[PDB]
Every structure is written in structure tokens, then in C-alpha cells.
């Protein structure tokens, strides 16, 4: 956990997130929808288990991005929930929920669900 | 289960589903987006635990509706997963996933998630 989590991670689509894992279980960093532009970077914050079990278990973690920055506001927020798995081929396997602000009539279509794997290796 | 499940159920929005629970764990019936029109009725099929546990547990079940009938095709399917709970105020508490057919570029927005409670009482 901690030292293993801090770093740059890439998913299958080409998105980048840069995270620092703090000693007291805090995650802070930025998500970039594309590898090189300020207009596509968004703030993230989250938490992780800072004393994970000593058998071969993953480290549980989660984070949120609200999709507003200085250039764009998409009136929506995503949360990722998953676990870090260390070793030679470190990865974070996640499921995610994306909620949009809706009217009450449209609330049934407010939330999408999907899944994402992050690796330290950009392919 | 079975005899308790067979019947008409209503959710909070005003949708109706009519289901027969067969002796060998089959569910068959129709979902109606609104209480009185053929253009809004769709076929459902599903399965349930036909020998549930004898302590106070719910009966696990699930069903699928593909949103195509003789009048409309919305190129999408929903599955409901949950459990029947019997008694004086019988209900089926569900979570659901709605998937639309997408192009591969748009596959990230293909699936919505929500939840629904069905009661035998229309309010």
C-alpha cells in the first residue's frame, strides 16, 4: 500500500491519474482524460486502508472526481471503488459509478456503472 | 415463494408487472410501463429459488425485459436482481441494470443502475 500506490497510473482508454497516498490514509491527485492538457485535468480526493492485512490480500481504496475545472463543467461526479494489488505487475481493479445532476423526473437515468483497471505501464 | 410471488405488483412510479411463478423455478409475465395500453407491454422471463430457506430469509429471484414489442424498439434490455419478502406487507426489493446497444466507442455509457421496490398494493 502507500509507497506502492503513490505514482502515475494509466487505464486501457488512455486516461492518467496521478496520486499521493498519505500516511494517514488520504489519497490526493489529479485525473487527466487525456495525457497532456490542463483543460482535461480534474482534482481527485479519496481514502485507502493504511494498515492492510499481511496475508496476500489487496488494499481497499476509493476516490471521487467532480467534473468541474476552470474550463468546463459537466454537472456530474464519478466515484471509483476497488483494491490495489502489488507486485511485479501492480494494478488497481475498480468498479465505478458516474452520477449526473438531473431533474426529479429524470432521476432514473442519473447513474452509470462500469469498471476500470489501472496499471503503472502505459501500453 | 411461488404462490406468494404469482400476481400483480406495482412500483413507486406506476409500472405494473404481472408474473406466474412455475413449480420448477420459472417466472413468466409482462411488464407494463403504464397501467393500460398494449404498446407499453413487454415480455419478461426469469428464475427464482423454488425451495427457499425455512428461517426468515427472502426468496432470491431475477428477470429480464428486452424493450422491443410490436410497436416500439428501444434497443436495450433491463435485468432486475433481488428478493421476495412475504407476509402481510409483501414486497420485492430489487436492484436493476439497463444496458443499451452502443457502438464500441460509446460502450462506457452503455449501462445504467438503479433500484426498485414492488408492492401488491397500488397507492
Amino acid at each position: 500500500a502507500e509507497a506502492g500506490i503513490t505514482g502515475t497510473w494509466y487505464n486501457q482508454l488512455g486516461s492518467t491519474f496521478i496520486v499521493t497516498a498519505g500516511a494517514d490514509g488520504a489519497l490526493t491527485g489529479t485525473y487527466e482524460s487525456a495525457v497532456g492538457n490542463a483543460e482535461s485535468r480534474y482534482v481527485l480526493t479519496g481514502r485507502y486502508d493504511s494498515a492492510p492485512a499481511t496475508d496476500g490480500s489487496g488494499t481497499a481504496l476509493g476516490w471521487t472526481v467532480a467534473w468541474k475545472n476552470n474550463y468546463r463543467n459537466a454537472h456530474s461526479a464519478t466515484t471509483w471503488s476497488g483494491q490495489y494489488v502489488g507486485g511485479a505487475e501492480a494494478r488497481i481493479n475498480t468498479q465505478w459509478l458516474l452520477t449526473s445532476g438531473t431533474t426529479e423526473a429524470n432521476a432514473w437515468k442519473s447513474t452509470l456503472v462500469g469498471h476500470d483497471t489501472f496499471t503503472k505501464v502505459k501500453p | 415463494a411461488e404462490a406468494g410471488i404469482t400476481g400483480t405488483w406495482y412500483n413507486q412510479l406506476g409500472s405494473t408487472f404481472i408474473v406466474t411463478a412455475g413449480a420448477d423455478g420459472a417466472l413468466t409475465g409482462t411488464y407494463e410501463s403504464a397501467v393500460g395500453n398494449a404498446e407499453s407491454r413487454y415480455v419478461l422471463t426469469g428464475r427464482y429459488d423454488s425451495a427457499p430457506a425455512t428461517d426468515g430469509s427472502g426468496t432470491a429471484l431475477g428477470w429480464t425485459v428486452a424493450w422491443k414489442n410490436n410497436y416500439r424498439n428501444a434497443h436495450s434490455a433491463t435485468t432486475w436482481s433481488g428478493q421476495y419478502v412475504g407476509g402481510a406487507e409483501a414486497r420485492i426489493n430489487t436492484q436493476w441494470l439497463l444496458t443499451s446497444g452502443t457502438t464500441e466507442a460509446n460502450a462506457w455509457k452503455s449501462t445504467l443502475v438503479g433500484h426498485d421496490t414492488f408492492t401488491k398494493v397500488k397507492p
Binding site: 482524460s33 487525456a34 480534474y42 472526481v65 459537466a74 | -
Partner: peptide, 6 residues
């Protein structure tokens, strides 16, 4: 496209 994706 949503910024999570582009």
C-alpha cells in the same frame, strides 16, 4: 463525449 472519456 463526457470528460471521463475524452
Amino acid at each position: 463525449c463526457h470528460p471521463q472519456f475524452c
